Structure formats: structure tokens, C-alpha cells
Write a protein that binds this ligand. Structure first.
Ligand SMILES: Nc1ncnc2c1ncn2[C@@H]1O[C@H](COP(=O)(O)OP(=O)(O)NP(=O)(O)O)[C@@H](O)[C@H]1O
Ligand SMILES: Nc1ncnc2c1ncn2[C@@H]1O[C@H](COP(=O)(O)OP(=O)(O)NP(=O)(O)O)[C@@H](O)[C@H]1O
Ligand SMILES: Nc1ncnc2c1ncn2[C@@H]1O[C@H](COP(=O)(O)OP(=O)(O)NP(=O)(O)O)[C@@H](O)[C@H]1O
Ligand SMILES: Nc1ncnc2c1ncn2[C@@H]1O[C@H](COP(=O)(O)OP(=O)(O)NP(=O)(O)O)[C@@H](O)[C@H]1O
Ligand SMILES: [Cl-]
Ligand SMILES: [Cl-]
Ligand SMILES: [Cl-]
Ligand SMILES: [Cl-]
Lengths: 298, 298, 298, 298
């Protein structure tokens, strides 16, 4: 019988095309199921595995997670589906263990702080961010302008450049109303984003400039240019890939000031956006990695 | 047996002092219990009435509601207590029917819009506000600076003066995190707030200026001066007092531009803040009002 | 220009077919837009009206509300869209005012209690229900078995027959976890549901028996039989139609014990399910009513 | 300067008494602060550490977590405080990494399933539970009576013994209102609970029987008897103690059927209840453990 791969993704792409001809241990056919989280439900059993309902029912053998499991500004919460697939004992890329731990940005950021403490600010320039568990301790910032980031949200949501204290005070009331946590960090007058990605043993670096006048350079029209990988960029991404027992797919993003300094602001996992000119190549590297992992199982 | 009045209030006042010596129809004594919403629970019955627990247990005959039942920035939600008291058939000031309908600012604002459509902008100069059910349709505003007011909140919370379109975009992105509705309206360069109140048949008008540099004139230190009532002001509040079957206590607030134009921005009910130099007279007027209502009961 | 009717509905039906040939004041063409709540967004303006986006944009002139605006067990909350359409000043069936007040079952039930108090248990046999604002006051019930109903939910959701005190205690912990209110009432050993509906001046009565062995007789396969209207049934539905300024469409449901007694358990508004053999006739009566209301406008 | 230990606990005990006279490396004094989660707030910084406010303000050096950080039936959620302390780089017992991962019972259960897959049912007799991400896939169970356990809750809350399929259907309908996940497993006709605990290198086994007629043997009055540790029990707890990078304090609980079979039902961490006649010795062992950990710091 074919091994069933479930690709969980919201991207407008047909994942089966990247698996054409690929067989587990060069022997067993791979059936590719594809759905976004909102289309999936399951029961999971101590005795072993998951029965998945896609709206059709099936027991998956392997998961590829391409979609964010938690997106607070969209009102989407699939963390319990992640719990279920892990309860079923499913092997996955990235590991369901890491995917679950990635469902809170400040929790992930706490791992970046460990890297920072170990490597130092010259090797790993992490942005000097502050974390507030709720609105109450938020009074001011040491440096304006400041970037305030609410909760666990993506694609620029929940994020504001605050210019002054009066404005900061009014934003803290929004943190209160949202009943969530928040972080603050210096706004960097940045020329472009830098993102270093790792897919298995493939590395790429890109610079990204907003061509729509956006300080959130990952929103709206952007110009993307692939740049040379350096050993400095490689240490960033390799260091990040070590967390939560290991990340098969990940990326680290920095902002690059007009003064020449980089500041690491974020890390991403197997649900990272695919950017630049090699998106089709990147999905094929992901499919290659998945088949290799499937073949390493009994 | 004394008739039991339950005053629900968060203010630091002994309400019993305004009722001492007051009897229902000059005959029956009034027992005043007082608590804030957070200290109260109840069961309500089709067969009639409520049993209230106060942390003492008792069956109230009449309710005075002085505290806001819903405050999103405080994370306080006592709407189900208001449902309960109405379910029990309790008479109150204001009516529990009106109190419940007051737990959504834009719901109440829709009633102001009905008055505005009827009386026109000369007699009832309602601010030209826009309502958004969520963040999605918020793109821009016709005129900057703009005041954005998020959800249902009090005492200046979730109210933000936005200077320009770029800043507006970031505000829209954090509004999303509150998962609630929002309103926009033009910022008025205002000399002072005007508030017209009604307590039964007693009318007062106050002007209020921040003496602590706040565009939110109802926050921080202010100077308050009582001003003469006019026919113009009397129509504003009288009109407002007809909503939701009739409001015994209410107030209408306007801002007054440097160029001499008034803009109505808010209506308030029996939980309105008491302001200026006649706070104790106002509480006494409220007690006299409750007693006249209590005297209509069997 | 055509008058735009927005029918908000989740039913698999094409509403335009019921409006074919119908013209406002026999003169103006009616453009029928149809969507479910999840497909709609809007901005609403003090200056007048709403701009609606359906996923196409338009200003509606009249609303028909066929869909529940709030369904807690489905995680669907459209109350802010109701607020918006009312803020826009939209005329509707039923009134947006009543539709909003219908978005809480115990709040509606409090109106049934007023009818009960006025008419008496012989003319209006309301079930003797208790309301709890939260889990805390819930200890036991006076009669087992009891029906416990959590929050504001439809189609049988949030509802359980509890046989004993130990079971009741464990259900109260579910009320706590759901952070909602609940009601309790005697379980009636019922032969069938009785539902009396009023669409304008059209009345129908049905009896409904579960043929799938369900105490929730409105879930699963049922046998429906139309029965004769009586003056007793007419008083029930006419009395209910008076609430929240008037209900153009409504229904009242009772359960009928094996001992011969009826117990009114619920009232429904313009989003009531359509049942029995005359669903197509009922939608046409609704369309007739809508056009008549549209014609009574300027 | 004394090293500051923050004990987070809701228990009515003076933790300072177990540390009096204990010095970090026999040299530096320990200052013990104690509070429950509800009394604490903080800011955490990339540059290092947390400032904690206790309602006093201070920077802790080490944390002991004795209180549950997440209790859905109590409406208590302190997960963002746990994030904060980890963000600050705080060492703790148990590790803040493990504490956070323990805030979802089924997430933790998935780790028990890994141990079960490895050791088998003879050595590690895990109850054959099913996990449901939400109410939708809950239709029936293979064996009645069944224990349904809703969400993430403690002290018997949301745990319901369901006797049959008809009752199960109603439970499913109220589970939906909690908007969370749920688990089902066979009810064991149990003589007593067995709990095996580990505190550092100290092991105890207790049997516990309800003396107040409760299938939930950890609720109400019980009799507790310490029993001999065995290799069998030692493997259960040792296995469990390896999860999430290592647990310094943990316990495994089983139920023991009338026919003599054990079924493992739960694992607990540093917030485990202290039980039986050695509660004070157990707290002292915990203090000795914290001191040995604190002695490893600079
Ligand atoms: N401190 C900062 N200074 C300057 N620019 C910043 C800063 N933080 C974020 N940005 C910019 O804003 C963009 C979005 O912020 P980011 O923190 O990456 O959130 P996000 O869009 O939610 N990320 P994601 O989860 O991948 O969708 C970044 O790509 C930068 O271009
Ligand atoms: N459009 C506006 N232009 C200028 N000032 C405004 C405007 N809207 C509000 N204000 C000012 O800000 C204050 C607070 O706004 P308001 O809408 O009254 O919120 P609030 O404080 O939540 N009211 P409340 O519920 O009584 O506590 C008002 O008293 C005015 O002084
Ligand atoms: N007290 C009761 N005794 C016996 N049967 C009852 C009782 N209450 C409800 N039922 C039955 O359960 C069904 C569903 O309960 P109901 O209170 O009508 O909730 P609902 O299904 O959410 N209604 P709706 O909002 O129209 O979808 C009723 O139609 C009756 O058949
Ligand atoms: N499947 C089962 N069969 C028989 N008894 C059970 C079963 N599951 C739980 N119990 C009993 O019910 C008690 C409570 O269940 P448990 O799963 O421990 O929930 P809890 O009280 O929330 N645990 P905790 O987090 O330590 O407070 C257990 O101590 C057992 O005595
Ligand atoms: Cl998001
Ligand atoms: Cl508030
Ligand atoms: Cl529902
Ligand atoms: Cl709990």
C-alpha cells in the first residue's frame, strides 16, 4: 500500500507535482494528500496513529507542515490539530514537536536569546527586545521610536512603529483590550531586510527592499535580490536550526541599518514564506528532504 | 419588611447615607445593599425574582446601576449579571433593558444617528463618525488627524489620535489584535468638553478643560464650570433620554471647536461619571429618583 | 436605479426567485443580493448608510435576516455586522433592533417571563427555568431529570439531560470552562414539539416527533405534521411578536408531555428554521412581506 | 548580595522555613520571595534577566514552580508569565522549558505515548485513550462506561464518567461550548490510585482510596498509604522524567482494577500535589534540590 503524505498548506500550489516519481526507499509509492488546516479534523489513538477527515478519510504516515498553526490577527487557531498529529505519533517535517513550540513568537525568541548569550552580539546581533506578559508593566521605552508587537501574529499584523510616549501609552490600552502579551524593541532605520534560509543542507540569502514605501518590508510590493552566503550568515541559520530538537527547514531575518549594522529580529520554521526567484526550487528541495526522511523510517 | 435596594457601584461612597429617612410611600423602610459587580452573583427564576449573593444572600426589590457593566480595556464583563437581574423581573434605574442595550457604544451611537437623521445637524450636531465591524475595511480616513475608538471601553482607553495615513495603517494592524469593532471620526481642535446631564427632572450643563495638557479632556486634572442650560442643550439630552424605552439618568457630551462649533461625541446612562462641584447633590437627586420609582411598586 | 435588497442567509436557496416581478410601490425594480454572514463586511456612516463588500461592493437599501447572527458552539459571531447595518440606518425584516436583542437566549427569555407574568400559566405555559450568570451559583436542581443549556447556541448544541446530582456537579465544571452562562429547567417527557409560527399575518402550527429516538426532537430525522391553529396558539405567538418593538417573523415552541400539558421552551425570530411541507410557501410569504415593507418607505 | 529565589505557589506554606540556614555553596545567603501567579508581573529583557513586581520589585536569580500555570476550569492562565521567566534566561525547578510544555495535558500525554511505544504495555501500561482536537469527530466510544476529559483542567474538573452512547451524545454537545479539545478512555473499576513520585533522587509510592465514595479518588477525603517502591514503578517514573529535557520533580499516576491490572492515566511535574504523611519532608527535599541547582550558578 502507498505511504500517505499529508501536506498541510494554504499556498496556491499542487504539492503532488514535486513528489512525482519519488518512492519510499526507492520502492513504495507515495500518495500525496494536501489540505489547509481549516479543512482538516482527526481522532488520534494511544494504540497508534490518526484518522484524518479532509473536507474523505485516511490514516497519514508522514506530515509536511507548510502552514502557520496559529495566527491571532486572522482568528485562526490550529494548535490542537498539531497536538493531535503528535499524539498519533506522526513523523513530520519539521517535527511536530518543533512546530508546536513555534506557535508562540516570544517563546521562540527566548531560544534566540540563548544563542545570543552563547555567541555574543558580534556573531549573533539579536535586537535588544523587551517582553511584557501583559499590558500592566508597560509604561515607556528607553528609546523612541520603538516597534511594539502584540501577541502571535504574522504578515505585519499586530505591529506598530511608536514615535513617542503619549502614543505608547495609548497603544498599551490596545494591548489590554487584546488580552495578550507584547514586545518592544528599537525601530531600526533599515535599508532592507536580510533573510537567510536553510532547507536541509541547502542555503540561500536574500535582501528585500520595500518598493511600496513600507517599514514592514515583507508587506506589499518588494524587490528581492539573492546575495552571497557567508560564514557569518551560515552561523546565524545553523545556530537557529538547533532549537526544539532540530529544525529541518528554517530562516532567520535581520534588518540592516543605514549605519551598516544588522539586527536579527525573527526566526521561522517549516511554515516560512517562500521568497524570491527560486520558490519552485525550494518546494522541490523540501519534497526531496521529505522523501529522504520517509526512507529513514522502518 | 423593608424593601431592599441593591446599588451596584464601584465608587467610594456610602449610598446608604442618601436614603436614610426615606421611606417607600412614607411607610415602608428601605434597606440599602451596595456592592460592585465583581462582588455579586445570583440565580434568577421564571417563578419570579433573583437571589443575590454578595461577597450575605438576599432577594432585591429594586436596582440602581451606577457601574459600567462592560469594560473591554479593564477585562471586565458583567453583562450576564445584567441579563440575570432582568430575567428576575427587577425594576431599576436606569431600566435594566436600557442598561443592557448601553453595553455597546456603537449600538448606542446608532440611536444617536436616528436622532441626528430626525433633528438635523443644526439642532443635533453629531460628529461624522464611521463604524467598522472589524479591521478589514479600515484603509484610510477622509480627514486627518482622526480619532480611532476601539471596541467598548471607557476613561480614554482605546482612543487614539492618528496624525496621518501611514500611522493609520499601523493602528489598523493592532486593531485587528483586539478582535473587535472600531470607529473613526475627525479630530476636533477643542477648547473644552460640554456635558449636559439629566437626573429625573434635574438638568445641568458643565464645560470641562484639561489643565494637564490632554486632548482627552475627561482624563487627568480638569477645570469644571457649570454653565446655563439652554433650549439647545435641553433638546440634545431630552432627545437622547427617549432611547431604549426611556432613560431616567443620562448625559450627552460634545466637544467645542476653537471656531465655535459643537460636535456631539457620546451619550451616557445611569453609570455616567458624576462631575463638577455638585456630585453630592447629584447622588441625592438620584436617591430621590429611586425612591419615587420604588414607591410605584406593590 | 433598483432598490437593493440584501438577504443574509446560509440556506441552500436562491432568494431572487421569490422576488421575481415584485417592484417597490409597483414601480421600482428590486435587485436581490444574497450572502451568508461569513461572506460580508461593511463600513457604516453617520452621514447615512453602509457600503457592503461581498466575497463586489454596494449600498443596500433593505435587509432580510434569515441567518443566526451568533452561534457560540459553531464559533460564529456576526453581532458587529448587525450593529453596522443598524448604524447605517437600514430598514429590515425583522428590524435590526430586534435581531440584535435576539442574540442572547436568556435575554429573549426574560421577555417571555414578562408575557408569562402578564397572561398566567394557563394562557402561557412557560417552562419554569432558572438562570445562572456563571457556573458559581450552580449547585443542584429541585427536580431531576433537568435540562441544562449553556450559552447562546442552536440546533441542540450546548444542551444536556442531566439525571442526577453527581452528573450535575460535573456539568457545572464544563459551564466554568466555557466561561458562559447557563439555564436549568425540568426535563419534560414529551411526545412531540409544537411550533406556532407567524409570518406577517400568516399563521401555521406543526407537531414534530423524533423518528431517530432523540429527546432533542429538532435534531435528526423527524416526522412533521401540520395541525389546526387555535386561539390558544394564536395568543402565544401574537404575544411573543410584540417584543423588541415588534417581530414581523417569529415562532414559539412548546413541548407536550405524555400527561397532556404543554410547556413553552423557546421563541425564534426572522432566522427561525423553516419546517414541514410549506417551506417554499413560507419563503414566498416572507418575500411578500419584505416588498410590502419596502413600499411603505419614502 | 544574597541570591534571590522566587517560589511560585498557591499553597498555604511558608517556603522560607525550608531554606533557612541553606547557603549557595555554603557561602552566599538565599533570599526567598514567595507569591502565587496572580500576584506577579514582570518585564524580561534580551540583555538579561527579569524585573519582577510582586503585589515589591526585584530581579530573581532562580525560580521554583509549584503552582499550575494554566487551569481552564478556574479561568487561570499564567502561561505568559512562564514565557517571560524563560525569556529572561532564568534557571528553575522544574526547568521553565518543561513547565511551559506541561501546560497542555494532551501534549504531555503524547510523550507518555512515546514511552509506551518504546517500552510496551507490560512495562508501561498506558490507558488506551483517544484524543479529539474539538467536538466534531466525537461520535461514540468502543467501550462504555467511558471517562471524557475536557481541555486542560485540574482537581477533577471537566472529567465526566459517561455510562452510554445516548449520554455521550449530549456530553459531545456541551464539549463544543468549551471550544477546546477532549479525550476519551475506558472507565476502570479501580480499587485505588497508585502514584509514584520523584523529587531529585528521592522516590515514593502511595496508594490512595476515596473514603467519600468518589471515582475521582484525588477529590474529597481519601486514605493514603505509602507502599514499597519496585523496579516496575521506578521504570515508570524514570522514563517519564526524561521528557522535555529532563524533569527534576515529577509523578506518574495509575488506577488499579479490581482484577489486578494497572493503567497509567497521568504524569505531573513540579506543580504536583504533595500527598500522604510526608508532605513536609517532600518540601524539604525540594528545597535541598533547589539549593544544589542554585549552587551550580556563577
Ligand atoms: N525593529 C524593527 N526595526 C525596523 N524594521 C522592523 C523591525 N521589526 C520588524 N521590522 C520590519 O517589519 C517587518 C515585519 O516584522 P516581523 O517582526 O518580521 O513580523 P511578521 O511580518 O509578523 N513576520 P512573519 O511571522 O514572518 O509574517 C520586518 O520584515 C521588517 O521589515
Ligand atoms: N473626535 C474628537 N475630537 C476631539 N476630542 C475628542 C474626540 N472624541 C473624544 N474626544 C475627547 O476625548 C475624551 C474621551 O473620549 P470619549 O469618546 O468620551 O471616550 P471615553 O473616555 O471612553 N468616554 P467614557 O465612556 O464616558 O469614559 C472626550 O471627553 C473628549 O474630550
Ligand atoms: N425542557 C425540555 N424538556 C424536554 N425536551 C426539551 C426541553 N428543552 C428542549 N427540549 C427538546 O430539545 C430540543 C432542542 O432544544 P431548544 O431549547 O429548542 O434548543 P435549540 O435546538 O438550540 N433551539 P434553536 O435555537 O431553534 O436551534 C427542543 O426542540 C425539544 O425537542
Ligand atoms: N480512566 C479512568 N478510570 C477510572 N478512574 C479514573 C480514570 N481517569 C481518572 N480516574 C480517576 O479520577 C481522578 C482524576 O483524574 P485525573 O485524570 O487525574 O484528573 P485531575 O484530577 O484533573 N488530575 P490533576 O491534574 O493531578 O489534578 C484520578 O486520580 C483517578 O482516581
Ligand atoms: Cl496573524
Ligand atoms: Cl475599559
Ligand atoms: Cl451554535
Ligand atoms: Cl482547572
Amino acid at each position: 500500500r502507498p505511504r500517505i503524505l499529508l501536506v498541510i498548506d494554504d499556498a496556491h500550489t499542487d504539492w503532488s507535482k514535486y513528489f512525482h516519481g519519488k518512492k519510499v526507499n526507492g520502492e513504495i509509492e507515495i500518495r500525496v494528500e494536501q489540505a489547509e488546516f481549516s479543512e482538516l479534523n482527526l481522532a488520534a489513538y494511544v494504540t497508534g496513529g490518526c484518522m484524518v477527515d479532509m473536507q474523505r478519510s485516511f490514516k497519514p504516515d508522514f506530515i509536511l507542515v507548510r502552514q502557520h498553526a496559529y495566527s491571532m490577527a486572522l482568528g485562526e487557531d490550529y494548535r490542537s490539530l498539531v497536538i493531535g498529529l503528535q499524539y498519533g505519533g506522526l513523523p513530520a517535517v519539521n517535527s511536530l514537536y518543533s512546530v508546536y513550540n513555534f506557535c508562540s513568537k516570544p517563546w521562540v525568541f527566548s531560544q534566540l536569546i540563548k544563542i545570543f548569550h552563547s555567541l555574543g552580539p558580534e556573531k549573533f546581533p539579536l535586537v535588544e527586545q523587551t517582553f511584557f506578559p501583559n499590558h500592566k508593566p508597560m509604561v515607556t521605552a528607553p528609546h523612541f521610536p520603538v516597534v511594539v508587537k502584540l501577541g502571535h501574529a504574522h504578515a505585519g499584523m499586530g505591529k506598530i512603529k511608536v514615535e513617542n510616549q503619549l502614543d505608547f501609552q495609548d497603544i498599551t490600552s490596545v494591548v489590554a483590550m487584546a488580552k495578550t502579551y507584547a514586545t518592544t524593541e528599537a525601530f531600526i532605520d533599515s535599508k532592507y531586510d536580510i533573510r537567510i534560509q536553510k532547507i536541509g543542507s541547502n542555503y540561500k540569502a536574500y535582501m528585500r527592499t520595500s518598493i511600496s514605501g513600507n517599514w514592514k518590508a515583507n508587506t506589499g510590493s518588494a524587490m528581492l535580490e539573492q546575495v552571497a552566503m557567508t560564514e557569518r550568515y551560515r552561523l546565524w541559520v545553523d545556530s537557529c536550526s538547533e532549537m526544539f530538537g532540530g529544525l529541518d527547514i528554517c530562516a532567520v531575518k535581520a534588518v540592516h541599518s543605514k549605519d551598516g549594522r544588522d539586527y536579527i529580529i525573527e526566526v521561522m520554521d517549516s511554515s516560512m514564506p517562500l521568497i524570491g526567484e527560486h520558490v519552485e526550487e525550494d518546494r522541490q528541495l523540501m519534497a526531496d528532504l521529505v522523501v529522504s526522511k520517509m526512507s529513514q523510517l522502518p
